[PDB]
């Protein structure tokens, strides 16, 4: 009674037969903002099922020489659904998340992925290599949407911080002998009770193969990874025209 899970939120439902468990981030469940903590006087709209539901972004292919990918939140859902219109039409935003990563393979494949949630994953540059240039990353690479961006130097996570110590944040491991899902439930993390979804990204989702995928030819060489994510306890406030960026 642990390797099976049914995540039901809204009009969506994910079944799993080869789960590990559910991680709840920093031991806090997602919630709404108190009256003590709030400052804005406007009454926020709390749409409970039209945005709190599972969305499915795109697929990335785990090849042999794959290095890793990251997805910035909530940039993934600003052009997608009733969530991504309210985020455009409003100035503020506050939601938790339930991330779900799927990678199914046989009992003759092997490999491991680290699926980590790093708050405030600020991106660095190679400084031209020499270290002389104070270069900055482009908007394509800082906020890449739902198609994600691949890491060039995954040992340092493209920020100068090591992959080894990333298990101090939230994480699960997708070991193809043991599991094919990873469920992480994230609360809202910010110094502020509310912030804008289009300028500030609250956290990043790292997917890194620590162990390389291996199979003997004859098997299926195409092993996708699909990110599936639900907002939770979402709140919006400050209504004006729709702006994309």
């Amino acid at each position: 009674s642990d390797r099976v899970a049914q995540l039901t939120i809204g009009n969506s439902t994910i079944t799993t037969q080869e789960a590990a468990n559910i991680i709840v981030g920093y031991g806090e469940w997602p919630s709404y903002c108190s009256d003590d903590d709030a400052t804005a006087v406007d009454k926020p709209t709390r749409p409970d099922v039209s945005v709190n539901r599972f969305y499915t972004l795109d697929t990335k292919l785990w090849e042999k020489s794959s290095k890793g990918w990251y997805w910035k939140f909530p940039d993934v859902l600003t052009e997608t659904g009733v969530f991504g219109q309210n985020a455009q039409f409003h100035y503020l935003y506050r939601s938790g998340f339930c991330i779900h990563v799927q990678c199914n393979a046989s009992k003759f494949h092997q490999g491991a992925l680290l699926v980590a949630i790093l708050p405030e994953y600020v991106i660095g540059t190679v400084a031209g290599g020499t270290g002389t240039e104070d270069s900055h990353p482009p908007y394509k690479q800082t906020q890449p949407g739902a198609d994600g961006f691949e890491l060039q130097h995954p040992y340092v996570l493209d920020a100068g911080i090591p992959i080894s110590q990333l298990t101090v944040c939230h994480h699960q491991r997708i070991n193809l002998r043991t599991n094919n899902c990873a469920t992480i439930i994230v609360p809202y993390m910010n110094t502020l009770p509310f912030d804008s979804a289009l300028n500030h990204c609250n956290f990043g989702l790292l997917v890194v193969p620590i162990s390389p995928l291996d199979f003997d030819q004859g098997a299926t060489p195409v092993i996708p990874i699909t990110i599936t994510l639900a907002p939770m306890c979402s709140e919006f406030a400050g209504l004006r025209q729709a702006v994309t960026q």
Binding site: R3, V4, Q6, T13
Partner: protein, 50 residues
């Protein structure tokens, strides 16, 4: 005149039709209850065995 235990402990001659079911009144369609999000493990009401 039953004396052995192989005939006292018998189910032969059991004419009562043992049923697993029970017909209950259904004058109207079944009503719907309010339901919320579930984010738990162990219980999977969507996975069946036909």
């Amino acid at each position: 005149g039953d004396r052995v235990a192989d005939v006292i402990e018998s189910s032969i001659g059991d004419s009562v039709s043992r049923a697993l079911t029970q017909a209950l009144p259904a004058p109207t369609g079944q009503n719907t209850q309010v339901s919320s999000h579930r984010l738990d493990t162990g219980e999977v009401p969507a996975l069946q065995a036909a």
